[PDB]
Design a protein around this ligand. Structure first.
Ligand code: SF4
Ligand code: SF4
Lengths: 532, 532
């Protein structure tokens, strides 16, 4: 006989476990009505604008308890490494500055993603995408955020959209008369650490699955600012369904799923394998960015049904900029998830490097120290990331020289958020180093980029280049963009390619800028043991 | 200054270019009403059951014109290889059998996927997933299809759901009062050939993108029954959005997108790079499964916006079992895409191998011929695929011998659809060989699986195993499950593991079963040059 079984059967489908605050007076935007014997809700679409604006504003200044608890856990655990505690302390202090509501917690204020669930009898007028986008436009336009969306004018010619649009708007049709939401301000770095694997039945035994987890977790590296929320999805009805599921799992959206399967193929959370993932993460030694125990905050493992011929697998993280907000509109008005507004309650030996000298003198000083040495940088950084590197390579391919500004100073891979009025800099932390790896040997061979500054482990070609050319790669802490802006960055100037927005070349003056020597000029790599 | 721009702006959003048929009398399921000044449509949810039942029945017996035209092109093109023409003729003859409405075109009748777009004022009662699932249940229960879904009772313990449920039900909230659908009966083999790559700005130039396409197309190999509809998506707002987009592109759902980008980041189809994909596919020499020009029917390339730090890329195919159906419900009733009911209008030596001999004598005969030799098999095949291979390896890990029935006959990797009344067998084509690669050396070392029969290129370990043990891998044509059942398969009996259903070990008798020698007993592989 026919028996319908929904794949996802959360015991808390409306997220009653979350605390919400009502937007004051927002009941003026809704009206409960009764049509053809059923309860319906008229919603002024302006409510969607109000809600998206507040959500994509608040989420940049506050965090969830389970995120903050993880940093405090990394500080208080006796088994944490010194680097574990240093990174976690820095990120918590960063969260305290972001809670001042001026600087966002990360310079990468993310892609705006909306998961919406509009009830059959929730009536908005139907222009939901436009009104949601206007609220997002408002949040990024009128706050000290960043325009991160790159439009393709043709296959290769690109420009910044200048407003952080378009958003990803996934609006679903569901029963009832309410409107439920998950808003995600998704950073590019953690979005890049969402992986799809095509596997087989040969994986589905304890030994093979454990080895698989050990292998794949290492490929995450430190490039998305751990401690991670690690999500793992085994199975799925299609690649895109698996990847949607691992995204939502990383947002703890499926925490209330059943924990056992059944003959109808329902999804379930697997706490036993979450514990195994956490054991792999801890024993890896990768740590909170620079070696230790706190590679991961927590783990979510969801087992899904599969076509007999198929076994898609998804792996994804939520990064230090852990930014999602639940919300709903009902007959009483607009409700938005309450984040922690007082992160301070969760709070329970370096080499001074003067950059104000010839770059060869800085290289000689750095050459005296092993990888893993904590440094503090004082002086000028030249800022350049993906597009500027591509333009400079193209210039050199046409016979033009490597520009002078790639030869005078360490290269900081970064793109700033907008500068608050009266501030020296907006949030201005690093971007992922690995994306620039293909340029390092080329640029060093042409007399520049000897010292680079960013975050994440890099490929072997960069280790070889630094040894061949006497270069260095310095790893900044990943994520603490607001405290770096408040305490370290003293002057910001646009140097070249202003049309690229945040991806322009910048010249900045910094003081007390912390970093680790990750790659030296001798073939050493402080990630060589944990990530290889 | 705010301008809303939807990412996807098809010029034919309601698919007017597609021909639809009305379900007779279906206007009885809908009623136009007016509520708060707005036009709404009441839809009896039984309409969803009727529509899903007809869609997931019809799609297994008929094809779209552009699919059939591609097979005809492979026969009539002077540049098609002889093997191109042979394969395309076989697939067209298979489609003629399937159009008889008894045998489905492929034994893998797929995962049932519904993309639904319910208007704000389309009122179904809200139980859409149950009623859609009942229609899907009806189609797979009451027709000669296959139950292909595998439930996870725990992480590793699995069972078949016995009804091809659960479906993938992606129901979206959209403007208006209609209900629009794309139904996809997605085979597992092509679902497995959906890949996500995390790339960078360094890819976004003509030389790098061309080399990337050349590299990735080869990794598709022949294991998903080409000629392929190849879809490539560059960019996207998230991994899951990229993979959803490449899925829909492969179904030609986005054919009416604009062909230029703009400063707002709208998606566009790129005809120039579609031509380049087709040039790469044709010049690859991979061909329609066995060498030649017709690796691909056609190509779709969508360029998407991206976060500056991100460049997700999706690559996916639609296989020979190209199965999708558009539909909509409106004030006039239920409309469903009209597929081609007369595929015959598109229609314009070998070595006899007796399998009824000692397996060692069959090995000696096969040893006389080079790879690429076409053979015609007559006799017994022992049928076993993923689950049976895993269970047999598990038995051996527990000290049990390889069963005798794995040593007497060639091993056919396949799983049959249900047997029509009065037929010797239901549709019964091959399964992808690569998924069994990890078993071959082990099984041959214990005296069995010397000759295997399936589809697709295999890994080096199988070539090395066949050379070490005097084995062979034979490639059946991929896809022609109905004509194989009708013409070649004369008897089917369950031999072992009846509890596994479709994945039990079968003993079948075949006549005039065509295959190519893909791997011989000498280290040769007919794909070594095209898939190097
Ligand atoms: S915390 Fe790190 S990975 Fe996350 S958005 Fe910010 S820079 Fe990117
Ligand atoms: S056997 Fe071939 S045609 Fe059939 S679903 Fe699998 S890949 Fe597609």
């Amino acid at each position: 006989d026919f028996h319908f079984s929904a794949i996802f059967q959360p015991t808390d489908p409306h997220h009653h476990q979350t605390e919400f605050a009502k937007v004051e007076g927002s009941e003026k935007y809704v009206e409960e009505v009764e049509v053809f014997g059923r309860q319906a809700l008229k919603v002024n679409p302006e409510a969607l604008t109000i809600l998206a604006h507040r959500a994509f504003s608040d989420v940049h200044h506050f965090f969830r308890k389970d995120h903050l608890e993880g940093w405090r856990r990394a500080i208080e655990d006796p088994e944490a490494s010194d680097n574990d505690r240093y990174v976690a302390t820095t990120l918590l202090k960063n969260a305290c500055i972001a809670a001042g509501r001026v600087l966002p917690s990360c310079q990468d204020t993310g892609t705006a993603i909306v998961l919406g669930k509009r009830g059959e009898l929730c009536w908005t007028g139907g222009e939901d995408e436009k009104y949601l986008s206007k609220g997002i436009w408002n949040a990024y336009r009128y706050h000290n955020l960043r325009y991160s969306q790159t439009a393709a004018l043709d296959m290769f010619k690109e420009c910044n959209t200048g407003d952080n649009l378009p958003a990803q708007l996934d609006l679903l049709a569901v029963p009832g008369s309410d409107y439920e939401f998950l808003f995600i301000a998704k950073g590019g770095g953690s979005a890049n650490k969402a992986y799809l694997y095509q596997e087989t039945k040969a994986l589905l035994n304890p030994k093979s699955l454990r080895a698989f987890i050990e292998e794949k977790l290492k490929t995450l590296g430190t490039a998305a600012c751990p401690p991670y929320h690690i999500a793992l999805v085994i199975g799925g009805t299609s690649a895109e369904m698996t990847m949607k599921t691992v995204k939502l799992a990383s947002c703890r959206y499926y925490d209330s799923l059943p924990t056992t399967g059944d003959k109808y193929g329902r999804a379930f959370r697997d706490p036993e394998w979450e514990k195994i993932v956490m054991e792999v993460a801890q024993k890896s030694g990768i740590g909170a960015q620079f070696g230790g125990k706190y590679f991961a905050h927590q783990a979510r493992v969801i087992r899904l049904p599969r076509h007999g011929a198929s076994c898609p697998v998804g792996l994804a993280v939520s990064c230090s900029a852990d930014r999602q907000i639940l919300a709903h509109i009902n007959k009483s008005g607009i409700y938005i998830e309450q984040l922690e507004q007082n992160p301070a309650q969760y709070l329970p030996t370096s080499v001074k490097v003067d950059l104000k000298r010839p770059i060869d003198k800085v290289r000689q000083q750095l050459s005296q120290y092993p990888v893993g040495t904590r440094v503090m940088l004082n002086g000028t950084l030249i800022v350049a990331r993906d597009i500027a590197h591509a333009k400079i390579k193209e210039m050199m391919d046409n016979g033009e020289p490597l520009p002078e500004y790639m030869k005078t100073s360490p290269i900081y891979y970064a793109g700033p958020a907008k500068t608050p009025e009266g501030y020296a800099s907006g949030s201005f932390g690093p971007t992922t180093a690995g994306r620039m790896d293909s340029y390092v040997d080329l640029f060093q061979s042409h007399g520049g980029s000897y010292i680079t500054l960013a975050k994440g482990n890099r490929s072997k070609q960069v280790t070889d280049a630094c040894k061949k050319h006497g270069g260095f790669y310095l790893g900044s802490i990943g994520g603490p963009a607001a405290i770096l802006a408040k305490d370290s960055i003293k002057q910001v100037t646009c140097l070249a390619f202003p049309e690229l927005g945040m991806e322009a070349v910048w010249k900045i003056e910094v003081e007390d800028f912390p970093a680790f020597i990750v790659v030296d000029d001798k073939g050493n790599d402080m990630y060589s043991k944990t990530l290889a």
